[PDB]
Each structure stands twice: as C-alpha cells, then as structure tokens.
Amino acid sequence: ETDMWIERTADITWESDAEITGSSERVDVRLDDDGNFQLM
Amino acid sequence: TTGVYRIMTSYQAGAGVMVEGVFHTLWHTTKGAALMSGEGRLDPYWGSVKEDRLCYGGPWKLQHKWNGHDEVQMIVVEPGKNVKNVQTKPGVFKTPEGEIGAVTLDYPTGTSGSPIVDKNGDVIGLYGNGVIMPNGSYISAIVQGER
Amino acid sequence: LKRR
C-alpha cells in the first residue's frame, strides 16, 4: 500500500503583488542519466 | 480538480499541479508511489528519472514553456504555510540540448514540484531539480517537457 | 542540496 496522498491548496494563478527577487545566472551544466544536474 | 497540490506522507514531501485531469510532479518527490486523492487512488502514468518528471492519471498535459523574454512566478508551496508567489527573471542552465531556464530561489525540501507560471497563469515548469554553486547558492531548473 |  502507499502512504502518500495529495491535498489541493490553491488555484494556479499569477499574483500581481508578488515580491521580485533573485538573479539571472548563466551556468554550464550537464544532466546525468539519474537526473542529477552536474556543474561543468 | 485543477490546481496546486501538496504531496503528503504527517508531513509534506513535495508539491505538484493537477491540469486537465493529470497530476504532475518531479519524479523524486514520490519515486512513482501511488497517490491517494479525493477522487480515489492515482497511479503513475509516465515518468522519466533522467528528466526528473512524473505524471499520474494520463499523459503530460503541460504544453507551455518559458519564452526566454519575460519574468516568471513560482507558486511557493512551503510546508506549514499558505502559498505565496515570488517573481524572478530566470537565468539559464547551458546544456547541449539548448538552454533551460533557471531560477535562483532557495526554499525547503517540501517545495519540490511547486509550479512556475507565466503571466497568463500557464504552468511553464516545476521547481526543485538543480545545482548548488561553489558559494553554496541554489539554482533550480524550470523543469518541463512537451505535452 | 541539488533537489527540493
């Protein structure tokens, strides 16, 4: 049996008042066969 | 029912979105475990370990991607908190198959699978598979594939 | 780490 479940919490929407944060970085990476990104 | 969901196991293991009757998350949040829902048990339909994507109830429905021009919002599904959106201009992971939009947003483990949306409120991908930079900063891919 |  599974011990996991899902619960709805919110609509999918854009919030006009959202805080703006973060930066636009540019990084070389490879994606390995088990789904891990690796820095190059 | 279409919307944003928490994945529970109680504590929050991750998040995802229901769109067009299909539940979408990152592979690593459940590892393909079945999910109980208000509409009964959901079984994994398609998954890719390499892409870290997984959907339940039918094929991948999310058809939109980052346009490479605009800011995006993450609907942050933090454990123990109401959702809140944060807006950011993605950078990129540079890979051989093209660039992948990437966001410098650092939230708790329970937040993997939180959706990233464009200005039309369409889901362009999911948060929580990325890299740690040498200085310790986290950057997630906007994780997405074709519908 | 690398995932959330």
- Give the H/E segment covering residue B27: helix B27-30
Q: Do the strands B84-88 and B91-95 form a parallel or antiparallel pair, or are they unpaired?
A: unpaired
From chain B, pick out residues whose CB is under 8 angstroms from the CB of A32. 50
Rg (CA), chain A: 18
- CA dist A33 and B96 (Å) reads 14
- CA dist B143 and B55 (Å) reads 13
Query: What CATH class does B63-147 carry?
Result: mainly beta
Residues 6+ apart with CB under 8 A from B31: none
Q: Which fold has domain B1-62?
A: Thrombin, subunit H (2.40.10)
Is residue B112 flagged as an active site residue?
Answer: yes
From chain B, pick out residues whose CB is under 8 angstroms from the CB of A16. none
- CA dist A9 and B4 (Å) reads 6
